[PDB]
Structures are given as structure tokens and as C-alpha cells.
Design a protein around this ligand. Sequence first.
Ligand SMILES: [Mg+2]
Ligand SMILES: [Mg+2]
Lengths: 311, 318, 319, 310
Amino acid sequence: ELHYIGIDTAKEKLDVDVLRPDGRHRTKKFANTTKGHDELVSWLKGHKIDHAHICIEATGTYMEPVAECLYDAGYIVSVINPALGKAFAQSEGLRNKTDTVDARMLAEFCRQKRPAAWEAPHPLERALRALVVRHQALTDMHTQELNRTETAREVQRPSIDAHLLWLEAELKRLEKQIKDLTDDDPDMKHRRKLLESIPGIGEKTSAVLLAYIGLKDRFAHARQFAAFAGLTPRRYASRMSKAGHVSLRRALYMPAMVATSKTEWGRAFRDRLAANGKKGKVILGAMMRKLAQVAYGVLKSGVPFDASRHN
Amino acid sequence: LHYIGIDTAKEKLDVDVLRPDGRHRTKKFANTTKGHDELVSWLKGHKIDHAHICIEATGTYMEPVAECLYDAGYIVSVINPALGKAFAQSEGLRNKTDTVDARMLAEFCRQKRPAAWEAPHPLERALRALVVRHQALTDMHTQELNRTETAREVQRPSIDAHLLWLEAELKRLEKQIKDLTDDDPDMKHRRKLLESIPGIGEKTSAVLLAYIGLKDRFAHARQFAAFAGLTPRRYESGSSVRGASRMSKAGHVSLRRALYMPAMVATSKTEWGRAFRDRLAANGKKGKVILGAMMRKLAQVAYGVLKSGVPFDASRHN
Amino acid sequence: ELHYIGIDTAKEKLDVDVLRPDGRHRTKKFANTTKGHDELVSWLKGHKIDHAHICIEATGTYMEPVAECLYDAGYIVSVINPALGKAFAQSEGLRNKTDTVDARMLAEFCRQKRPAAWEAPHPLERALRALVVRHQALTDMHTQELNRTETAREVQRPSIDAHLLWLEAELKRLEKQIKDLTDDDPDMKHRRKLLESIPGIGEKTSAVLLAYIGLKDRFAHARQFAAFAGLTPRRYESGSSVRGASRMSKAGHVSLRRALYMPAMVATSKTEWGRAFRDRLAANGKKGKVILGAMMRKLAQVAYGVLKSGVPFDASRHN
Amino acid sequence: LHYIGIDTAKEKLDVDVLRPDGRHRTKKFANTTKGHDELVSWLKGHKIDHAHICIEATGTYMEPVAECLYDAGYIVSVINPALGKAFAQSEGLRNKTDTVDARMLAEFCRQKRPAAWEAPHPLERALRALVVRHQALTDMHTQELNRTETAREVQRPSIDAHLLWLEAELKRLEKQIKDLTDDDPDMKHRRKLLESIPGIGEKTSAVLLAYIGLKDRFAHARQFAAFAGLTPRRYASRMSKAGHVSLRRALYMPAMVATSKTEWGRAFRDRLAANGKKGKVILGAMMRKLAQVAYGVLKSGVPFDASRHN
RNA sequence: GUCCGCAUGCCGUAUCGGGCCUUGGGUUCUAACCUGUUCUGUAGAUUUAUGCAGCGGAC
RNA sequence: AGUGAUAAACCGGACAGUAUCAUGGACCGGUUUUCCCGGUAAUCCGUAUUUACAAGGCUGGUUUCACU
DNA sequence: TACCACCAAGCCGCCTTGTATTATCCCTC
DNA sequence: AGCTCATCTGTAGGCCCGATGGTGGTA
DNA sequence: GGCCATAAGTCAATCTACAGATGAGCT
DNA sequence: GAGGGATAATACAAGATACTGTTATGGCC
Ligand SMILES: [Mg+2]
Ligand SMILES: [Mg+2]
């Protein structure tokens, strides 16, 4: 008696498409609002829909409250990568894109593919991720202003200098904020301490890795976490896939340089690939993938980085 | 019910059966009359009576195996290869190969349960073949016409000779097409109906009939318009995304191209066509936009008139 | 007796190529430093090169000190748009060794084209431009943070709010520094006051316009200044067959072009002369942004015209 | 010396004179024998006897006026259109109109002083015309031959009929080309020299002889290879492709025949093969080589000597 | 008829952003091996088609 | 909300082509601090047809109307 | 005298399966 | 505890959204 | 009845010169 | 000695300029 529901989301309104077991549809649109979300649940309970599998695109801020609302109401929620949604529309040979079309498409996606259920993240996991990506935003702004000092006019330098001081101070207090968060929870404190034991990974990288791994082991294999960062190769003469979080992939590049240059186990890996005629950037690409796997490996193991296991 | 996918090449067929229990059977065959008879036997040898075959429309090399299995009594689906590629990308995010194998086609078949393909009538097949041939010679004739305008005098005898040959051959095919449609009572009747529409003549009636066929395969005339790839493609999301509607173009090019010059004639020289043009002109539509719209109109009316079984009644339109 | 010199510039190194009247070349490489600039001038006097025309390409701020050095040495200096150079290279042959432009190619550009002489801008013109460009940079940084408040998480919001306060204060401080600069000079004070008399141009736009028009009248016609902003249409016509619809050329200063867009909306919407303009083009069946595109050009020309006239904006001239 | 620029179209000419003083005179004309006589009279009516005209190679619409002015005694240059466009961009021109481009060609002429154009020999024009026609019919024959692969049975009679017609016509031109070259004693001798090269047959010799004239108009053989667009350039290096396409396309199959079935060709292949070079890359190189050797052999005036490539 | 002046007509779709999602493949089998070119930037340059219409001035 | 009808209305820029142009980098000699004159069928640099061609596949989004 | 919100909002379909050219050597009649 | 150095042809996909300035109108 | 002119026909600025990150080991 | 078949090569992709035809219908002979 499982219903299949699809929800296209916008800032202002939601479009809901219920696909019944019999095969008929029920469609209704709601305000993307706490009130509106309460109406949606009542409307589903209205038609005696208790068992259902809702499917939503991952479009960010505007779809998160309703996903949580329905999850709490006790329905199976799936939050799918939008690129899959696009490919699925093309596979269904659809000739229009509208909100009611999308909602209907998502209900079909849900039925045909039966996606894995979505788990709402832990409030600490959300907190840490928010701080980390904020820290990245400020770093980018600091780097922009540093570039400007190179070719600044003398009348502009007072302004740039002032801003650089502000940004430096802000980055410090936010680094402390991140440290306080991980220290307060005994699990995150332990896991972060493990991550830092890896030579090539320090205070900054550990916090980024921990923001995406979380405080649970959600991946079956370390290789999957490497794929999740978009670091595993793809035949397309193979290239780095880049199908994954950019925040992870940007965070591991300097760790990879420090590893292949300054560490024993890194230099070992660098030397071996260099023998096979691999280029510098190619080796860094490979080491980024390796750091990701070891990071997840070490946490799953639960014991500090053992060098014996490498080289 | 089994779900079977067939990957096809010139020489080899790759087959993948998906059993109700969830296990697979795989086997390769030669893409020949022998290997088709081997394929059917192999299926019966695993007591596979009911199956849904999914083949992708990859040239004409898949045509004889599809007919073989349709005659063997299986449900055959010949799918647009663009759907297959899209299906693979919907199954995974990074995936591998970015190619559609027999296994992927079996999974496509199982999930989507696509509409059953039907082998065309020999006359439908002949008419389509003649129309396609006619369009090829027209394009060659245009190539040679273009050459006359900048030809050197030593080239000109050769070009003129070829133009005469091409003109005579086009004349011969048109007659061959007319003899085809006149002989069958149904095609003779259906071609009259199409030609009753203002803006549709001998050339276009043959092209429309070549794609519509003897039977009424489309439930609605809108679907035939979509089949030609003439409908607008709406692109809307929330408040932010406003994509200006462009013509979809997701359909037969040979059918779409054949309706352009009729659309000009209709909008310029017929009452019902001018009426249509004038209305859209008032709503501030540009020239080719209106032609675009008229092309879709002609497709939709062409199918409509055939279903009605009655000559074009102008009172139905403004 | 005029020589033609091309200088290929890098951050660290200068590459010089003299083309002599007789046709032979003199090449010598220098450091891109105050020392190497005085070395360069001495090397030219070494080869008794008194009258020359020097052609440098506009590749950032690294080429600016050498251009001033040679200008002061008394030579004719031309600073060329690098796109011109690349096109010149392609005009010289169908299968050049490389597409890149070198000092030799710049010397040849100089000889054939005889390009317009470059003048080092007035220290005030420099200063005002610098402040205006800084102001746009902070505005963009402010816009990023203001976009972020839309989707921010609650833990992020203190950090964003703090930054928005800092950027607002800093923007206000620069606007004051710009006003102090134009008010101190009697010519800039007067010229700015004329610009702000145009309905649709206020404090911010007047500063940007001055930053590009400058102290003197360096354009001959108003259309040239409109072209300088990349606002003139781009007509593409040939014979009968080839006829592409006109677009905005966009071949000009982006900072100047971006400054005019919101003024154009204000003018076409809320002013008498602006609505008059909007209606005229609306009658001929023109779209919203197409009219705004047109009004941006109109504003640029009127801005230039008003300054030339030396009198406040008269609305009667536009009817 | 005046500098004149003519922008040509099917129907109209746009003429812009640039006087020594720097003043401009502009006038439009019809692209007809009448309008060409009007043009000369208008130039003579302003006492313009010594001038350098600069036209861009825009189809066969500019060929009549170029010959008219050449005969009138002026210096005519017919420039590669790509150079013209690059020159316009170097002048910073935003707009592109016929009046603008006529002025620009006068300025091109003033600054670049390009090489004078020479009207080709009538035999050279005839041979080029037939060879070009032959390539066209071959392409059409190939199209119909591809259709035979997947032709429905109702279509096959039509395709078979057309293939026979094209095959008959192709022979007729090959015969017409040979009757042309055999009549002229210079063409005949030059063609016999070209065929003496292992890898070059009847087809290729006609194409080469169409682009090389009756006379040796390239100072060096390198230049002829460049003229085909077969010399490399860095952007790793690759074939420039900046030269005659008809000439270039004619050399690919001879290059395969050379590097496979001839001593001097295999020798070349082997050397490069044993230097890490790929198959197509060697073909690319052999295409350039054949072009260079072809012009070399003609200039030497003696049959192909293999000892020179041993 | 020519040469100039135009804050004129005709021709014109600005510039920059923000957020979020991502659970490979092969192998000697998951912290091992094979396959692997991060992420984000910064500064500067741009002089009418006056082409055709108007309107005004000089000849 | 279901059923039935849709040749109506709103949302629409089709396809295919043609011709023409193209005087290397370098290396080796003369003069000569690089101009300019000679030489090259050798060696090094080279992924053709500046898009090579053929065939096949493609069952709208809404609105409106009738009845319950 | 200081604060508010409101003007403008685009565009060149996707896939899959195939093959030719010329000149010289080599085999068959 | 603070500073220096390792990597340099190039080649993810997608679904949502906002700001700019100046002026007439309002408080 | 045969032959012929005619209807429709948009494009997304170009270049050149540059830079930083983080973590571990050494002064 | 003529006449016909076989064969060599295969990540991708990177200038300009000027042009034309299709069909069906109402007018015009
Ligand atoms: Mg959506
Ligand atoms: Mg031209």
C-alpha cells in the first residue's frame, strides 16, 4: 500500500504529486512555510496516506525544512542528486520542464528506482559543516585582498590593509569556534585527534574531513569516501571525475603537497609513481585520493596512523 | 515474464536475460539469419516463452533480429538510443564507460516497461523508402543548382548533364510514389484527405503519409506534433528560471523539414493560414516564430483530418 | 631619423627591439627596475637614438613605470590595447611561427600604424580612478555577503553580520575620501556638479564618469566616449546574404559600462526626459533591456556633452 | 601613387581611393562590364594613372574587375580574406560594413604594400576547373556508394542507376583532363615528370599540375608545401592547414601508398616510426614531403631519382 | 556642389554574484596495488561606420 | 474528484547546401653585430578531406468544453 | 529633513550503427 | 615559536536564488 | 489547362601580465 | 601481357569571404 510522492521545491511554494498504488495521481501545491508544511502532512493524512516514499531534489536551503518535516511525520524521504533527476527526465523522454512536470517526474523516479532513504544530519554535524564552509568563504576573500596588494595603488593600500587585518582576526576567532565545537563533544574530539595523527593532515584539514565524514561511519569502503569527494578517476585516457564535494577536494591539495614532499610515507608514494613517468600534478591528484581513503580508513580502524601499514 | 536486452553490432549480437528470480543468462550470437534462429532456439531451450525484449535503434542492423523475435511471439521494444544513454546516467552519478550494454537494456526494460514495437506494413516501408530517396535526390539537385551560379564554362556542360539526369529521376520517383498510393485503396483515400488541407500538396502528402502510416498509431494529434519535434519546449522553475520557449526539435528531422515551405504557403496564401498568422502577429510574434507555429499546426491538423476521415473543413478554424 | 622601438614587458624583465631607418635591428634585454629603466635610456643615447616612437602593450601595472620613464626621456610612447597587437600578428601572415607578440612585432606595429601618443594621466585622475575602482571592489564584496544572508545557517550569521557592518563603514569612508578629493580641486568640484545636474546621475555615477572622462577634453566627439565605454552598437553587414542583427559592442571599460545601468533604469522610469526617450523607442517596438542599453549610451554622450558645454543639464535640448 | 580598396559583392562594388595628401574619394559601382568601364573612366577622370589596388579574394565575383584593372595598367593585389579580417581587428574597427571595408583595404594596401597579383593562364584555369569538377563528382559517387550499404530494395535501382551515370561521367572528365595536358607540350612533359614519383599516379599528377602552374612561380619547394597547408606550427606542433584544401586532400592516399608500397616511402616511414611517431603523424609528414618533392622534381626537370632520398 | 559643427534622429538584451547536492572500476580486494593535471583567484588596456538622415554654420 | 472529447486557444526562429583565397619554422652559404642577397627533391618539427561521408531512432506542457 | 521601493529580467535538439578516397603490388585468365 | 617551500597547455554534472543607484513619493 | 513568382530568413566582447592555500621540519 | 581485387592509415580540436534551394498556391497567360 506504498504511495510514491515527488516534491518540486521553490522559495515560495511546493508542488506535490502523489502516485497511488492503483496508478492515478493526486496533485496539490502548498506554501513553502511551517504552516504550509503542516497543511501538507494533514493533506496526506486526509487521504489516509501513512506508508509513502517521498522523493525530493537536493536544491539546498528551500527543500531542507520540508524534508525534515516529513521525516519526522514518519515517511521514507529520499533526497536525490539533481543531476540524476535531469538524466531521468531525459530517459522518460519529456519535452517540457515545469513545476508540476518535475513533481510527477520525481514520483516516477521514486517508484522505478526506489532510492536509499535520507537521514537528517546530527545538529553538531550541521554546525561544524556551516563553520567550515564559512571559514572557506573568508579564506577566499582574504586571498582576493592579498592578490590586490601586488598591484595596488598607494591610495588603495590603507583600505586593503585594514580589510586584511579584519579578515585575519575573523579567521582566528572562527578557527577557535571550530576547536571549541569539536572539543566539547567527546567523539569529535577523539576522531579529530585520530585524523591529525596522519602526517600531512593538520588542524584545518582535520576539521574539513570531519565535517563531511561526520560522527558515524556511513561508507562501507574507504574507496567510496574518496569517490564522494570526486577524487577517484573516470574513463572519459582517464580523468579525475570531480563528481563530488568541492570543499573536500579543495581542502586536500596542500596536504597532498606536504605529504609528497615532507613525509616519509608520502615521498615513498611520490617516488614510485614518478618512476612510471607520472607528472607532478598527476601524483598530487593521486595523493589527494589516498589522503581521503586513509582519513576514512583511520577513523574506521579507531587507532592512530600506523606507518608500517604503508610504504 | 523475463526481461531481455540485446546490444547490437553489424556482426555480433550480445544478449542478456534477466530472470524473475533476479539471476542472469548471457550469450553472444552472430547478427545473421542463422544466429537469429540460434537465438530463438536458445530462448526456448531455457523455456522462455514470455519475455519483453529491449533493443536500441542503432541503424538498420537491428531491424531483422527485431522482426525475428516479434514473429517468434515476444514483446519487442525498439528504443531511441538517446533514452538508453540517459537511463545509464540516471542509474549512477560517476558510473563507468558511459555506454549502454545488454544488461543496462534489460534493466531499462524492467523499470520502464516501454511501449511495444510493431513491424511496419510492407507498403508503409516502401513508401517511406521512396520518400527518403526523393529527398536525397532533391538535395543533390540543389547542390548542382548552387554550382551553376559560379561555374566555369568548362564545368558547365557536366553540371547541366547531371541536372537533366536528376530532374528526370525525381520525375520518375514521384510517379513511382503516386503508383504506390493509388494502388492501395486506403493510401489513395488518406492522401486525398491530406491534400484537401490548404498548404499541403503532392510532395507533403507523401511525406506525411510516410510517417503517419496506414493505421492510427497516435491516440491524439498533439502526439504526432510532438513526434515531429514541433511543439514548444517550456523551461520553467520557481520564480528565478524563465527559459524562453524554443521549438523542441525532439523528433523526425525529415518530417520537420518537409513542413517549412507548406507553412510559408499557408501563412501567406490561404485564408485559414493568414488568419493564424495575423493573430500571432498581433501578439507580437516574429516571422519564423509564426512559421514554427504553423508547422506544428499543419502536423496537428494533418493527423486530425485523417482521424476525422473527412475533407478539411475550414469552419473548424479561424 | 625616427626609430621605431617595441618593448615586450614582463614582471621582472624587459625585452627591447629597435628598428633602425636602414632596416637593421638592435636588441637588448633589461631588468624591469628603476635601475634597468635608466640603463635602457642610456643604451638608447648610446646608439645616438634621440627621436623614436616606442610601442608598449597594455599588460597591467608592470609596464607603467617604464612608459613614464621613456615619456620623460622625451620619446614618443604609445601604449596599445593587447588585442590590437594579437590581430596585427595575424595580419602579418597566415602561418606565423607563433601567435604571440614579441618586441620585434611591436616595432613593426609602430612603423606601420604610427599609433596615437600616450600621455601619463594627472595624479588626481590617477587617485580618483583608484578610489572609484576600490569602491566597486568593496561593493561587490558587500554584495556577496548580502547574498549569503539569504541562505545562511544561524551559526554563520554573526560572522556575516559583522562583516557587513565593516564593509558598510568602509564604503562610507571611501565615498567621503572621493568627495574630499573632488571638492579640494576647483575644476573637479565644478565638473562633478555639472554631471549631477543630469537627471539619473548622482554622487556615485558622477565620480565614475569623472574617473574616465578626466580633467581635460580628451575626446573629440561624444560618440567616441560612448564607444570608449563599449556602448555603441556593432553593425555587421556584407552584400545581401550576410546581415547579422546589431548588438552592443562591449568593446570598452566594464567599470564605466556597469556604472550606467542602474542610472538608465532610474532615468527611463522616473525622469521626464528619460520617459520621453523610453516612449519613443517603445513606439518603434523595442524591449526593456534594449531600451536600457540605448539609454546607457545616451547618458554617456550627454555626460560628455554637458561637460563640454560647461553649463547645467538643459532638458529642452532633448525633445 | 594612390592606394585603392575595392569591396566586392555579387551586384555592387564599393571603391575607396586614398590620395597621397590623405584625402578619400568614394564611389559605388555595378559589378558588370559596364560598371568596370565606369570605374576605369572615373579613375582616369581624376588623373589616377599610377595606383595600387587591393581586392580580397571573395569568390569569383572579384575576378572580372581584377582582370579589368590589371589590363588598365594598374597594380592589383588579391589578398587572403583572413589577412583582411585580422587587419581590420588591428585597426580596432568595431563596425563591419561595405563602405568601411573598402576604406580598410586601401589602408591595408598603404601599410603592407602586398605582392602583385598575376592573372593565371587560360590553360591553368581550365585544368583547375576540371580537376575541381572531378573531385566534386567523386564526392557524390562516394555518397551514393555509402547508401548501397543500407539501401532498401525499392531504393537500390535508383542508386545503381546514379552510380553508373557518375562512373561514366568521371571517366569522361579524366579523358578531358588528359586531352588537355597532352595537347600542350609543357603540361605533357611536366605531368610525365610528376608521375615518375613512386606514390603519384594519374589523379594526383593532374591535381598537382593544377596548383603548380605552367611556370615555376615558387622560388623554393618549401613554399609550395606551405601553399598546401602541410607545414607544422606551434599553438605541441600540428599541421597548420592554412592552404589549399583541394590540394591538401589529394595527397593523403598517395602518402599511404608511398609509406606502404615504395622503397623511398617505407624508408621515410621506418625512420620516423623508430623515433616514436604515430601512423597518421607519419602520413602528415609524407604529405608535406610529396608536395615538396613534387615541386622539386619539376624544377630539376628530370625524372624522380631515388638515390637523392636513400 | 563642397567643407565643418551636433548633449540630435536611426542602429543598442548591463555588470557582477549567492546557496546546495555527489557512497568508482579493475586487482594479489578496501589505511595495500593499477587507473588520478586541486580549488579559488588578481590587475590592466578599449577615442565616432558621422555610415545615412535631419538641423545649424562657412563657402 | 472521476469519465469522455479536442483539426480550438496559450506556450514555437525548419532543414539542407554552394563557391573562392592561402609562396613555412628552420638549416647552410655570401655580405655583415640581426637589413638584404643566394641555396635546399637532404635532416628536424607534421593526427588528410580548415566540420570526410552514410543510414536509422523521437507518441508535448497547460488551458477550455460536456457529463456525474 | 530623512527613509522607502521600485524600475529592468532571452535565445543557436539528442543518440547509435556504419564506410571512401588512390596507386602499386600481386594473383588470375 | 615563526618562517619557508613543494605543483604549473587544458578537458565535472545539476537545481534553486539576489544586488547594483537615483528619484519621486511618503513620513 | 500550363507556367511562374512568391512567402520566411537574430545573435551571445577581445587581449596581456600575474597569485594563494597548509603543514611539517628547521633555525 | 592485360585486368581486377587488396591494401596501407584512424582520442578530440583548433582560418576567412561571398552566395542559394525547398513547396503550393493564386494570379496570369
Ligand atoms: Mg526542481
Ligand atoms: Mg567584402
